[PDB]
Amino acid sequence: SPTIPSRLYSLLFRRTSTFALTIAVGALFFERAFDQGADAIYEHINEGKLWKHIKHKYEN
Amino acid sequence: SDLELHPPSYPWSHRGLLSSLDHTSIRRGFQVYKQVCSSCHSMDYVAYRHLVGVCYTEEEAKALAEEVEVQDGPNDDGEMFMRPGKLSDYFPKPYPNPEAARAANNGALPPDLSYIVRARHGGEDYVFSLLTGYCEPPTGVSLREGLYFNPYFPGQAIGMAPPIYTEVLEYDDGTPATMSQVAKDVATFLRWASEPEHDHRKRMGLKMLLMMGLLLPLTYAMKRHKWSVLKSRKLAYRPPK
Amino acid sequence: GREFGNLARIRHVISYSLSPFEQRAFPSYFSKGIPNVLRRTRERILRVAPPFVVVYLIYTWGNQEFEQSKRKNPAMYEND
Amino acid sequence: EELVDPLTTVREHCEQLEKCVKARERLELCDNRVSSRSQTEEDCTEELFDFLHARDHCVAHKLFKNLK
Amino acid sequence: MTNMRKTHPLFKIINHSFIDLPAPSNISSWWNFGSLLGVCLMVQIITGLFLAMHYTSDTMTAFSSVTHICRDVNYGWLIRYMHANGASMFFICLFLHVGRGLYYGSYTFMETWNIGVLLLFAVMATAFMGYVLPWGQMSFWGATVITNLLSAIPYIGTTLVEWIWGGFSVDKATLTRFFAFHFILPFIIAALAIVHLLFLHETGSNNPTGLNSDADKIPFHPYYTIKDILGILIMFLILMTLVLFFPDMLGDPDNYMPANPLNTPPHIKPEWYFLFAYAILRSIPNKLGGVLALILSILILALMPFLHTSKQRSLMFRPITQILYWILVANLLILTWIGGQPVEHPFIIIGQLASISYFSIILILMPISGIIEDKMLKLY
Numbered sequence A: 001s002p003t004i005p006s007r008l009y010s011l012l013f014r015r016t017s018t019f020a021l022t023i024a025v026g027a028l029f030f031e032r033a034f035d036q037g038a039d040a041i042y043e044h045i046n047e048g049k050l051w052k053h054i055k056h057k058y059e060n
Numbered sequence B: 001s002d003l004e005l006h007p008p009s010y011p012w013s014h015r016g017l018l019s020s021l022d023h024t025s026i027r028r029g030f031q032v033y034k035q036v037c038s039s040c041h042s043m044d045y046v047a048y049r050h051l052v053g054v055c056y057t058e059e060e061a062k063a064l065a066e067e068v069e070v071q072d073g074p075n076d077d078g079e080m081f082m083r084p085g086k087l088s089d090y091f092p093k094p095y096p097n098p099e100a101a102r103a104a105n106n107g108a109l110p111p112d113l114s115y116i117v118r119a120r121h122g123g124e125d126y127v128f129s130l131l132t133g134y135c136e137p138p139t140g141v142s143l144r145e146g147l148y149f150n151p152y153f154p155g156q157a158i159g160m161a162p163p164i165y166t167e168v169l170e171y172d173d174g175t176p177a178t179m180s181q182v183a184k185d186v187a188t189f190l191r192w193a194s195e196p197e198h199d200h201r202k203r204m205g206l207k208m209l210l211m212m213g214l215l216l217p218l219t220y221a222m223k224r225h226k227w228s229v230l231k232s233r234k235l236a237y238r239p240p241k
Numbered sequence C: 001g002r003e004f005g006n007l008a009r010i011r012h013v014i015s016y017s018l019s020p021f022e023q024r025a026f027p028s029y030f031s032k033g034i035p036n037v038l039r040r041t042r043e044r045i046l047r048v049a050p051p052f053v054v055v056y057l058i059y060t061w062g063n064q065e066f067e068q069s070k071r072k073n074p075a076m077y078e079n080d
Numbered sequence D: 001e002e003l004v005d006p007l008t009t010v011r012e013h014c015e016q017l018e019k020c021v022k023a024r025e026r027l028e029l030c031d032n033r034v035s036s037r038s039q040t041e042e043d044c045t046e047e048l049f050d051f052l053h054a055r056d057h058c059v060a061h062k063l064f065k066n067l068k
Numbered sequence E: 001m002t003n004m005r006k007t008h009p010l011f012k013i014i015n016h017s018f019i020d021l022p023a024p025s026n027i028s029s030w031w032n033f034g035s036l037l038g039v040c041l042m043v044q045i046i047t048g049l050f051l052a053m054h055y056t057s058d059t060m061t062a063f064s065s066v067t068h069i070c071r072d073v074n075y076g077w078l079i080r081y082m083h084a085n086g087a088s089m090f091f092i093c094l095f096l097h098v099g100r101g102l103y104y105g106s107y108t109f110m111e112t113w114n115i116g117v118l119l120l121f122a123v124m125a126t127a128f129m130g131y132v133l134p135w136g137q138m139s140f141w142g143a144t145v146i147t148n149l150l151s152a153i154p155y156i157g158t159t160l161v162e163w164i165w166g167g168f169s170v171d172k173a174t175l176t177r178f179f180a181f182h183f184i185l186p187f188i189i190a191a192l193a194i195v196h197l198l199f200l201h202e203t204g205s206n207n208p209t210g211l212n213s214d215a216d217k218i219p220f221h222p223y224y225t226i227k228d229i230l231g232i233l234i235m236f237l238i239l240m241t242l243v244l245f246f247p248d249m250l251g252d253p254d255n256y257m258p259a260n261p262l263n264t265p266p267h268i269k270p271e272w273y274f275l276f277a278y279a280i281l282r283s284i285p286n287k288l289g290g291v292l293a294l295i296l297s298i299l300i301l302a303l304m305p306f307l308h309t310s311k312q313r314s315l316m317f318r319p320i321t322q323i324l325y326w327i328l329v330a331n332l333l334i335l336t337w338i339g340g341q342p343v344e345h346p347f348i349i350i351g352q353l354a355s356i357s358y359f360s361i362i363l364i365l366m367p368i369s370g371i372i373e374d375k376m377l378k379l380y
């Protein structure tokens, strides 16, 4: 039974072009997940102080 | 006296490393500036459109801009005319030129408060200590008209009358407008006015710390891979004797 | 003119190496990194540290001497 | 029903501490010395500065918890 | 077939200077710093170019253009504070590069050392005029003080200062020509750095043991490629934590006021990397004496290869000269602290003693110590 890095090498990491493809796909998915997580951390640090937390009080 | 008094450190809500500004306090401090500080001080590098998305909405800032009158021209006859203000307009001048400020303020020039916590040592702590630090002068020293004692001002003789007392304005959100609360709000507003990029800068810094915490051990591991091919190399000297 | 092939004359020297995929990148990182760092800092601390120690003393003395230089002398305003 | 400034209440609560009352004692010794002399150029701004430094240090330790 | 890397006339130079270059295997992290300097140069140039698309070199509009960059250009505050803190990072890496060259005996590469001290003079001039460029209170008064003390040269000094000013004082022509010169000098710095690399590549690099490393050399790629990449990443970490978290810890607050010729500041400083020289400049109560003290305080690095009296190149096996070197670093830090202090007691006597000790350690104490160290090993 092969392990996870062994199957990752056999399917993706062997060819350099597939290495580039999984790097690009992981780059876009990591970009989306990292911006979501880092943003959620940032409003969790500063709750009730940013404009998007007090925005509902003044809009009509 | 040439001796100076350093302002203390106050526990600001933006004092922390990733701590942003309290935007309700910036809104209240803008109200404090509009009703009190705008009579003498100028804000040449701040416009009304900077308030959109920070303290006010688009229509609230549009109403705030259209409350005042802006000189504009030239007309088709070549003459100047007053017009209602808009979002692209900057904050109105109290005086057309600094010599009018000198004439109206007994020879003193009220400085432009767009970088006033960036151009002073102490920052908003200095502004809070100056606004809440007006007191009677001690014995031995005497001061004339147009002068007021302030131990945080260098030279301890400021030409600015104390502008903030208890209930100098009425807030929109019903907050009690004491001297300390009004001074804290206007210090927060002046901190935003000097650094409008502050929350974005700290969010960028948080993302930078997370990315460097991800990337430094991985690049270190790649370096130690490509160098641990060499760091376990063994040598042997075999002379033929 | 100066490349690999004509750098030095070396005789009777054997080198052994292994693949980086064959060996660990962090072989006993802490357990041998800590005594090596301790050995290096104990071989260099007496040469490095005492100049910066006396910089700290000179800095503190100069700051406090300036502070008492701005201090009011109580000997003045004593005759009258 | 006057609106009470919390800064004032914190200010005398901080003047009840010991370094502030010692510096205030030196300030009264100075104004006793200076105000009882006819012609002098002595000004004691420096221990007024010491008293204000200690007092506003302990004020800034605990002022902002009472401000909305 | 044909190996394209070793035959193509553009790729051959790139190969010989970055891939198949024989480098010593044992050079520490200090040897990263020069490459960092090159990266910093590129970073400065790139950020400088993106400051130049919105900056106006007019005394009515220079401060307004800088505030417009910080407030209205998208991420313009980021590029401006990256430029300022990258100048500070440039001088940090420059000082550590020069300290590496002094400690490990790398000044025996004399042509490389002289091209280096020329690069150091050019970088200091570029940073001075760049700090004049935002036209704040501090910029105008620093330029006024530096040119006024440059007027100390007899019989030509007033004419030279009025020629540099283009007028009776620091005015619009001074700011515009300082913009032109600050724009053009980093490309001359890049060309001088290419000459610097050529003069190093005639003989290879030095190693921390100071011995002939010809028996143990490795290709530059991939070892020092990935080591320089790691150093670039660490330097970028320090630069972005300087920009995004403490953007004004190294600058002066008084530069955020507009330039008032009528109002003088209570205390006038250059930025921190000039400060020690400023202390030396005020350690002599004579204007020409202070000016020549500053010039020889920078040029003593050029005088350094003629003062080497030891039979060992590096200081790895030389403990007395190591102690003297760290005392030299110590009073360089002391002169940096004095340069930011006002001229009263005891800063005057501390700065005078620090300047005397600096020149006596570099000129007198190190060759005598090297003679003593050669005597201890039964060599002299």
Ligand SMILES: CCCCCCCCCCCCCCCCCC(=O)OC[C@H](COP(=O)(O)OCCN)OC(=O)CCCCCCCCCCCCCCCCC
Binding pocket: C042, C043, C044, C046, C047, C050, C051, C054, C055, C058, E319, E320, E323, E327, E330, E331, E334, E350, E353, E354, E357
């Ligand atoms: C006599 C040495 C006795 C040592 C006893 C310790 C135990 C030794 C045996 C056990 C081994 C322990 C670890 C050994 C580490 C390496 C060896 C070592 O530290 O050797 C001692 C070292 C070198 O000795 P050496 O150079 O021969 O002494 C000449 C002194 N000038 O010498 C030193 O480290 C001494 C350094 C003293 C530096 C004093 C500097 C004072 C002046 C600083 C001025 C700075 C600027 C001031 C301001 C100027 C402007 C106003």
Ligand code: HEC
Binding pocket: B032, B033, B036, B037, B038, B039, B040, B041, B105, B108, B109, B110, B111, B116, B120, B127, B130, B131, B153, B154, B157, B158, B159, B160, B161, B163, B164, B186
């Ligand atoms: C007209 C009576 C003014 C009112 C209303 C406000 N300020 Fe003012 N200010 C005024 C003058 C004439 C001066 C200069 C006095 C001098 O001797 O220089 C000032 C100065 C300031 C400063 C600068 C302090 C410094 O160290 O330079 C600040 C930070 C300041 N004033 C703040 C301030 C605020 C926040 C105000 C609204 C509550 C305000 N001032 C109103 C004149 C007048």
Ligand code: HEM
Binding pocket: E041, E044, E045, E046, E047, E048, E049, E051, E052, E055, E066, E080, E083, E084, E086, E087, E090, E123, E124, E126, E127, E130, E131, E132, E133, E134, E182, E183, E184, E185, E186, E187, E251
């Ligand atoms: C050719 C490339 C360069 C260009 C086009 C350039 C351009 C500029 C411009 C337009 C400014 C004014 C904007 C501002 O206030 O920041 C500036 C400021 C500055 N530059 Fe450069 N620059 C270049 C390279 C450098 C280098 C290599 C250094 C370092 C020696 C440097 C140091 C500075 C400094 C210290 C400032 C002042 C920053 C401040 O306001 O605090 N510049 N530069």
Ligand code: HEM
Binding pocket: E030, E031, E032, E033, E034, E035, E037, E038, E041, E094, E097, E098, E101, E104, E106, E107, E109, E112, E113, E115, E116, E117, E119, E120, E123, E189, E193, E196, E197, E200, E204, E205, E206, E207, E301
């Ligand atoms: C403009 C800034 C500078 C740049 C970009 C620069 C660039 C470089 C580079 C890329 C190297 C090779 C890598 C290394 O050994 O670190 C190097 C080495 C060297 N530089 Fe510089 N340098 C600069 C300033 C200086 C100065 C001011 C000096 C003189 C004090 C100097 C003297 C040397 C020496 C002696 C070496 C050889 C290192 C050795 O073999 O020990 N450099 N420089």
